[PDB]
Design a protein around this ligand. Structure first.
Ligand code: NAI
Ligand code: NAI
Ligand code: NAI
Ligand code: NAI
Ligand code: MG
Lengths: 373, 373, 370, 370
């Protein structure tokens, strides 16, 4: 088949959905790889690099979308792209549909077959395609929160680690999964006093073992979260219900009780945000004020480190890409239950139950389009 | 005596040279404390805070300078303050004279008695007043370097710590003293691969013990510096020869051979900069390009974290401030050789040999102004 | 029943198939334990140590083999022992039958019932009796790579950990499984800069968390693998692909590009080696040159630390030995599918499909004898 | 001035007294650096590497010695080199003149000015040019001890780290100084249970603080030492008594009570062993039996890892070398009392009191030549 990779178009999106190694492997398997000229430049992959691997370089985004049977992207199609969505094409990208009725409507109305990276889910419950991005986003959350804590950024004016005799920053991380663990680890590596909250006590046990209690753990209740957030210099919101809209855990009323100059980084903004006051921001204008605090709500965090994140992502996705290319969406999803959990839309049908409930749209069973005859 | 603390006037300087605890202790000792209205607001110390501790709040900077027997500051006087310098006043602050003939001439021509925080030196050779600021600046250098490595900042687009399976940032720190050690420590905590260079092998031994060889150490020669710098994503310049102009260790020629979008943070900018291309920058406009790299050269780094740095500084300076108030400069310096080593100017005489050598200006022995009659 | 443990007879094999602790447990359960005099001396277990535990010490190998209902060994029987193989006896040892037609035929001709340690396999797919040997081999690879890096051994002359101000050895481990993990851990403890490569990202993620990034991890793409190997003073090959010969990941062409005196330790030599240029070496002549490089490829690494290895193995085999002794092979294999997976021969029948196809011998389904 | 570096000519000596970094610093300052073709090959430094840094490479040892004002070496001049020693040249190398009347007399007869690396000494009493060699030797001790513990080398057959469920090696380090600290650190990083003994309780506190109690510490007495050694798989002797030969802390009688196959590495063999049974061993035959134990006694351990050792040493000597070249011996020694402590010979006068006492030669006070 033809697999196509357009340039990413979201604000400051420097990533690309394939590397030369992946192109050479698709070409070796008999596939045709079409890449928009310049697509890899943000990640320092030249057109010449992609060409040497076996790709054909096309001039326009229109032609990539039109000719590709399998379309690989990094982020979700935005408004100026909805017109390129096709019936009978497979879209394989991050989608975050529970957070976007407009994105969902566009996919459904086009009749396309889309599979979301972030809902591909193995039997142990892990999300292997989201994982590398959560690792990047969590590590970044610690450094951006540290940066915005500087008084020159409107922040409280506290050094992450303090210095001998002087208190460090108090950091609260909500969520002890991939992003929360990575945020906690880097914040702790910067010398900050880190508390992590989760409702999953086994994830708290993992953190407790790994850092020998140096990273504090608290069972997450409204009662506990409220007290921890009031004491915080920096709050990192890192919760997830897979494929679903994030719960609002930090109320604006609570934020009104925070220290002036406190910073809140909502990593969960891609799924709607776990702070009441959260709304999507961009790398161009990443922050806004709520009461006396600073909110940071960038929904494509890993875009700023594309030399890291482009490879981290494709290291994980390529095995699924190869199966989709070789066998098509239906056979690949039948052969691989984890891939099938990524099924999002097909021929006008919403195949995600959580997204269906979250948006108030009718739900079609994934087992129906995968049923045998 | 009257001890006067004006508002700092350097770009983004939120620190103040005393706290209410210090003010209360001088007042207890029978000294009058004059503070410019608003001097502590950057460090969240209100005029009310200073008044409750016993300070007289004054409206203008002109009055503080004119009335004060001992004038406490954080940074060196700048041009708009040159006219405020006075004969018969003791000025106690960070001076960095070897890096400013203009500041030196202004202090000499005024006839003022000045004592540099950064040359107060104990018999073991340590600089106890520079140290806390070096700790702050070193920790900041790592977080600020990480930030500027983001592609959105014009950086290489590499995450400090990488993520599993993907290479982390390569960080080179020049200088294994207080600032370098602290920069290495934080960069390493962020997951970067850190190499520290020094000519002092016992400082390398210290780092090797502390992080179990996780922080790499290399004997500093031009040859090792070159190889190290060419491989670096982030270079942190942290060398010092106490009281002297910093040596130029990274040439513009070497910078031309660096990776595109590499970041170089010159902490040693306050002594003239240890990179050939360094010139002083501000928190408003901190970076500029040299060849295909970004230089960061802020000479007042600890100003961005005044909640940490004002307290760290005053924790260290206050013991000396008390001796100067109680006994005046000559008796205090006679009784404390460490304080005497900070002596910089008196009545048009330059009392620092390193500054005199580096500026090509006549030197007068500190012992001669301290001699008994 | 009677459990017999003879002295190992293969060259440089100093291990033994039981310790005093296992002897005491068998004996407490009512079993007789027969041990050949001197069997434990290679592993620093004296005859007195075994007797104190309850063993009957026996003068000759013949008597042990003759009187044992269950015969425990470390290595496969070799040619001078083929006549000792016995119908109605259970043999439990490392067999590696796909590697020896001679051994397979001897086992088949003997009518004996044999169970191989290396194919005992639990439901998650782990091999609990190979595991301890992979741990030992991994840890040894770091120590032996360090030694051979000394210029007096023909290596580059680089100390694993450097000294302050001086560059440590650059160590690359290919494979993040049991042996590779253990290799990485010790080499990192010796102060080397360690990079681990794997195609399994979960295993890299585990290494990253455990050492907080001290041990570097790279996804095993051709570009990353070749880059890492070119920079390396020491390469440790610790790859296994289930059911297959080791892939040749390091080509002679790549080796021509390495630093002179660089050392390559191929743990996976027991599956053919994961370097193009690997071939079996010996404790007598453990290294050979390929290009300007030193290869080390010893197939029986754990034999070199028999005091450690004997305990690692027998701690792992113990629960299976106790079930076999208490219940007999058929009931024990019926009750424990992990054990049943080790079933190798019974009464002239070959019970492993992999061995059967590899050797060109008729396969008999294990279900048919159970 | 002209700084000359000849090839080392002692058997198995493959270090060199300068690196390209050193050559570049000397040449940037306007000095001429002359290096015998092939001098750095043992340390993986090619003639090309030296030339690129600014060295002139010369075909013969004779030319280097004849043309050099400052002659840098690693070992003492040997008999074949006595004819090359010159009045008006400065020699800077490890000399150990107390150990050789023949070398001392050749230096005196020649009229040469010589400075011993090993007696350069700062005010706190430290020997900064011996220090990197003690670091290398201590780290090497742990790796070679691990290797010789293998049963295939005649050791007990014990892996340093054990493996889960199995006992690690018991390692005893005698001396918590530079070599001892470094041996303890590497042996601990290999997973061994390490106990360090010293009479200096402050060195013990440093070890306790730095490894959080994981490295065990015991006050050194004959009684404690007897107990520790009897439990040890590996003993590392790393004692130094300033101004004296190594005390014999481990008697042959004690060695008789040790575990069979225990390994003892005597780092202090250069002063001429802290074990009663120690005698010089060689890289050809590095170990020998005492009772049921294996002794390792190599007097030049750092020559094993020349790439590491050369850089460790020459990074240490570099600032002294730059002073000598920039300012000549007289001004450099006057300005640096540490450097002056290394003064050995000048114009037939012997400037070390210790050497003059030991050999029965007249002593000339170094201050009288300065
Ligand atoms: N902004 C960006 O660029 C990126 C955002 N993300 C987002 O980060 C979020 C977290 O991702 P992962 O850490 O990979 O997920 P994860 O599933 O590994 O962890 C989420 C954790 O939140 C916990 N949790 C759920 N509800 C909770 C509650 N009410 N109170 C306390 N804890 C609760 C869960 O128990 C779980 O341990 C997701 O929305 C993900 O899409 C990920 C990558 C990039
Ligand atoms: N920009 C800012 O806001 C601040 C700057 N600083 C500055 O940072 C600099 C370093 O301060 P500290 O770390 O406290 O000094 P320190 O004395 O503790 O350490 C300096 C280190 O540089 C090494 N060094 C000197 N010359 C060298 C050479 N040629 N090559 C390699 N290494 C060499 C020394 O051996 C020493 O270990 C000073 O200039 C200090 O004033 C300190 C605080 C704030
Ligand atoms: N020489 C000796 O004396 C001994 C050798 N061994 C052998 O060592 C080998 C490794 O054993 P274990 O560590 O227990 O296996 P394991 O199954 O625990 O791990 C092997 C790893 O190799 C990885 N791998 C596969 N293909 C790869 C590639 N292209 N690049 C990088 N990594 C890749 C796998 O993903 C897996 O994580 C086996 O052949 C085993 O029999 C074991 C004991 C002793
Ligand atoms: N074989 C070789 O190639 C090399 C040998 N060496 C030798 O290693 C030896 C040790 O050197 P360094 O560690 O640098 O000396 P060091 O002075 O740093 O430390 C020696 C330690 O031995 C301790 N010690 C003295 N008497 C003791 C006793 N009765 N019990 C326990 N501890 C005692 C001292 O308190 C001191 O802490 C020296 O003889 C040195 O020449 C050094 C380099 C290479
Ligand atoms: Mg000079």
């Amino acid at each position: 088949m033809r697999v196509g990779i357009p340039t990413e178009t979201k604000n400051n999106e420097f990533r690309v959905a394939i590397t030369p190694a992946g192109v050479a492997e698709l070409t070796r398997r008999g596939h045709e790889v079409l890449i928009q000229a310049g697509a890899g430049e943000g990640s320092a992959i030249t057109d010449a690099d992609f060409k040497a691997a076996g790709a054909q370089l096309v001039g326009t985004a229109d032609q990539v979308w039109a000719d590709a049977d399998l379309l690989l992207k990094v982020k979700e199609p935005i408004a100026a792209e909805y017109g390129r969505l096709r019936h009978g094409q497979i879209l394989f990208t991050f989608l975050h549909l529970a957070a976007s009725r407009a994105c969902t409507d566009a996919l459904l109305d086009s009749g396309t077959t889309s599979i979301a990276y972030e809902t591909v889910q193995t039997a142990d419950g892990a999300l292997p395609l989201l994982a590398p991005m959560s690792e990047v986003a969590g590590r970044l959350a610690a450094q951006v929160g540290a940066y915005h804590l500087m008084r020159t950024q409107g922040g409280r004016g506290v050094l992450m680690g303090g210095v001998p005799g002087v208190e460090p920053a108090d950091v609260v991380v909500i969520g002890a999964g991939t992003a929360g663990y990575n945020a906690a680890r880097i914040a702790n590596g910067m010398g900050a006093t880190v508390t992590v909250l989760d409702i999953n006590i086994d994830k708290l046990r993992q953190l407790d073992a790994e850092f020998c209690g140096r990273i504090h753990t608290r069972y997450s209740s409204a009662y506990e979260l409220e007290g921890a957030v009031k004491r915080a210099d920096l709050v990192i919101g890192a919760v997830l219900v897979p494929g679903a809209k994030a719960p609002k855990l930090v109320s604006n009323s609570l934020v009104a009780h925070m220290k002036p100059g406190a910073v809140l980084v909502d990593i969960a903004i891609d799924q709607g945000g776990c702070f009441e006051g959260s709304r999507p921001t961009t790398y161009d204008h990443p922050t806004f004020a709520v009461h006396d605090t600073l909110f940071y709500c960038v929904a494509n965090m890993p875009a700023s480190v594309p030399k890291t994140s482009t490879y981290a992502l494709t290291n994980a996705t390529m095995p699924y890409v190869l199966e989709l290319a070789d066998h098509g969406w239906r056979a690949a999803c039948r052969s691989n239950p984890a891939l099938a959990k990524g099924l999002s839309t097909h021929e006008g049908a919403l195949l995600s139950e959580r997204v269906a409930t979250d948006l108030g749209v009718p739900f079609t069973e994934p087992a129906s389009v995968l049923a045998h005859h």
